[PDB]
Amino acid sequence: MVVLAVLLPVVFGALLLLGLPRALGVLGAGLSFLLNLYLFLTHPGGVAHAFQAPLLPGAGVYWAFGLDGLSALFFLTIALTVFLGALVARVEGRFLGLALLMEGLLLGLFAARDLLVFYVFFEAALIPALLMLYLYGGEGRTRALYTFVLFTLVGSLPMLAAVLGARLLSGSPTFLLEDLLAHPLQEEAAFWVFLGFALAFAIKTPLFPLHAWLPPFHQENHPSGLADALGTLYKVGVFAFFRFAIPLAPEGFAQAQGLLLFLAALSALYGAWVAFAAKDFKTLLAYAGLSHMGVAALGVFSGTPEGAMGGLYLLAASGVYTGGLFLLAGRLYERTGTLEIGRYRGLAQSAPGLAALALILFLAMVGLPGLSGFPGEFLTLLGAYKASPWLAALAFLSVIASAAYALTAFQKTFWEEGGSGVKDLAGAEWGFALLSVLALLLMGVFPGYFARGLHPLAEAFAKLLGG
């Protein structure tokens, strides 16, 4: 059950930090992966495997866990992404333990069935994030770190004012999500609470003016970029909105909603647009992530069960191919020595169908139908147009820019004139390719099975914004 799956990477990671070696923790990421996958193919409905334990009661704080259709999908997504990062690695300074630790922290973050524990995990995950940034790479480690940390926390601590207000002003007995929802806030209280959730969630989404931490962060992590993949799994903002910010204070969400749709839209367009200019894989993938999150947030912000389901799905599936592109960027880095796109041009023919793997991923990213990006992107479009057609269009002056950066980078990194040569594909890198492409194809070809659990949550948390 749930707490086992949340703790499993945490203990394996802890057994890794001090204990070593890597492999025992790689099969740890594998065990978490198989457990979470098994958990995906089993559960009937929203409750799933509930957990409730006293933590601070008298404060209203309980250890509460469980798997929605959503939580299950993310447990699968995350377990997979991190596992891929684990068997590929080439980081393995034995801080793959920090990685698994952050994995467990995020899993708890999504399984969190009550507000304060959610907060606990939201901030606690910052610890590995900041560590593997500091002590495991980058010339500008320190500025990227204080920027990232200070940003997320300046957003975060005032949210605590809102999480308190969520319970106090509503007269809710505890911090349990169900109870909190059973006690609605009134206007100009729901306003403030929603706002306090909203700064912390927009900044961690990220939305346009609040995204400036993202490029420094992704540059200064270890050039392999495992920490980048996990940083991308820490992009939980949209989810945080959908599950928490919006349902608890919808009266305020109503006021902010125009602005939110706007920021999401232009975040998508802007991100994909400046993504072109990137001269290194880290920066490129970063701004690309900004674009994707723009789309997702657009999907949620719309109301509309379609758009919401689409946005959540897009987040889920983009975890995998964004993380994957990061890891791969690291894997061609390791063989070349730079994340510069221009230098070391033609790699295809030197490398095997590594070109195929990278291209499959890039096509998933630009959202080619049959690959993971398109289903979410599409449902998102469907809902956005319902909400505000013009911003749907503005935001979807995107696919053009996506093809632009992805194909430009792909061409200049792989297709052109033969270089020195390279390695082919490692025994690990093959597991990576196979499992990855399998995933992309399955989530792109059967977005039916994944996101079935998203359906009830979507329409119910759409009617929430109805009567």
Partner 1 sequence: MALLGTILLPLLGFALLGLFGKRMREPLPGVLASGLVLASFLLGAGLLLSGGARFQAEWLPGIPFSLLLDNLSGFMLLIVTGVGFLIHVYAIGYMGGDPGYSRFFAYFNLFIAMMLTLVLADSYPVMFIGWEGVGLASFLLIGFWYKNPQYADSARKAFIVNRIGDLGFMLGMAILWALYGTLSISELKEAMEGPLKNPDLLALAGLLLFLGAVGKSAQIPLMVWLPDAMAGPTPVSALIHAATMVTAGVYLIARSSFLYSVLPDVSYAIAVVGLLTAAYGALSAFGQTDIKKIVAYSTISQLGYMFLAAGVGAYWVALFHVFTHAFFKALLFLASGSVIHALGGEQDVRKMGGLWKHLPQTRWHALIGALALGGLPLLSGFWSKDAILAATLTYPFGGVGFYVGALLVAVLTAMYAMRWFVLVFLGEERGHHHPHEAPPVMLWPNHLLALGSVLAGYLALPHPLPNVLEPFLKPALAEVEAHHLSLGAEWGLIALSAAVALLGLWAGFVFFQRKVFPAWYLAFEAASREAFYVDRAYNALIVNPLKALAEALFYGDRGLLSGYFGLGGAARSLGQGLARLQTGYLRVYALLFVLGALLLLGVMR
> Applying CB under 8 A, which residues contact partner 1?
147, 150-151, 209, 212-213, 215-216, 270, 273-278, 306, 309, 346, 348-349, 353, 356, 363, 368-370, 375, 378-379, 381-382, 385-386, 392-393, 396-397, 399-400, 403-404, 407-408, 411, 414-418, 446-449, 451-452, 455
DSSP, residue by residue, 245-306: IHHH-HHHHHHHHHHHHHHHHHHHHHHHHHGGG--BHHHHHHHHHHHHHHHHHHHHHT--HH
Closest approach of Cβ 79 to ligand UMQ, in Å? 22
Binding of residue 419 to ligand UMQ (CB under 6 A): no
**3-class DSSP assignment, residue 77:** helix
Report the residue from 353, 369, 389, 421 that binds ligand UMQ according to the rule CB under 6 A: 353
Binding at 150: pick from partner 1, ligand UMQ, none (beta carbon under 5-8 Å per type): partner 1
Closest approach of Cβ 154 to partner 1, in Å? 9
- Bridge partner residues of 53 (DSSP): 63
Closest approach of Cβ 315 to partner 1, in Å? 16
Nearest CA to 374 out of 359, 384, 364 is that of: 364
Closer of 348 and 406 to ligand UMQ (Cβ): 348
Binding of residue 435 to ligand UMQ (CB under 6 A): no
Closest approach of Cβ 389 to partner 1, in Å? 8
Of the candidate spans 51-59, 161-169, 277-285, 351-359, the one that interacts with ligand UMQ by CB under 6 A turns out to be 351-359
Binding of residue 368 to ligand UMQ (CB under 6 A): no
The amino acid at residue 190 is A
Binding at 369: pick from partner 1, ligand UMQ, none (beta carbon under 5-8 Å per type): partner 1
Is residue 8 within 8 Å of residue 25, measured between CB atoms?
Answer: no
Report the residue from 145, 355, 451, 458 that binds ligand UMQ according to the rule CB under 6 A: 355
Binding of residue 364 to ligand UMQ (CB under 6 A): no
Binding of residue 349 to ligand UMQ (CB under 6 A): yes
Binding at 363: pick from partner 1, ligand UMQ, none (beta carbon under 5-8 Å per type): partner 1
Closer of 142 and 349 to ligand UMQ (Cβ): 349
Closer of 142 and 420 to ligand UMQ (Cβ): 420
Closer of 173 and 370 to partner 1 (Cβ): 370
Binding of residue 356 to ligand UMQ (CB under 6 A): yes
Is the C-alpha dihedral spanning 334, 434, 5, 300 positive or negative?
Answer: positive
Closer of 32 and 267 to partner 1 (Cβ): 267
Interface characters, 304-343, with ligand UMQ (x: CB under 6 A): ----------------------------------------
Can you say how many angstroms the Cα of residue 219 is from the centroid of all Cα atoms in its chain?
A: 17
Is residue 10 within 8 Å of residue 97, measured between CB atoms?
Answer: no
**CA dihedral of 377, 382, 387, 389, whole degrees rounded to 10:** 90
Closest approach of Cβ 89 to partner 1, in Å? 26
Binding at 160: pick from partner 1, ligand UMQ, none (beta carbon under 5-8 Å per type): none
**Phi and psi angles of residue 402, each rounded to the nearest 5 degrees, phi first:** -65, -55
Closer of 294 and 447 to ligand UMQ (Cβ): 447
Binding of residue 421 to ligand UMQ (CB under 6 A): no
Closer of 139 and 417 to partner 1 (Cβ): 417
DSSP state of 174: S
Of the candidate spans 53-61, 347-355, 376-384, 386-394, the one that interacts with ligand UMQ by CB under 6 A turns out to be 347-355
Binding of residue 433 to ligand UMQ (CB under 6 A): no
Is residue 65 within 8 Å of residue 55, measured between CB atoms?
Answer: no
Closer of 42 and 349 to ligand UMQ (Cβ): 349
Report the residue from 30, 46, 93, 352 that binds ligand UMQ according to the rule CB under 6 A: 352
Closer of 56 and 212 to partner 1 (Cβ): 212
Closest approach of Cβ 267 to partner 1, in Å? 12
Summarize as ranges the residues that interact with ligand UMQ (CB under 6 A): 348-349, 352-353, 355-356
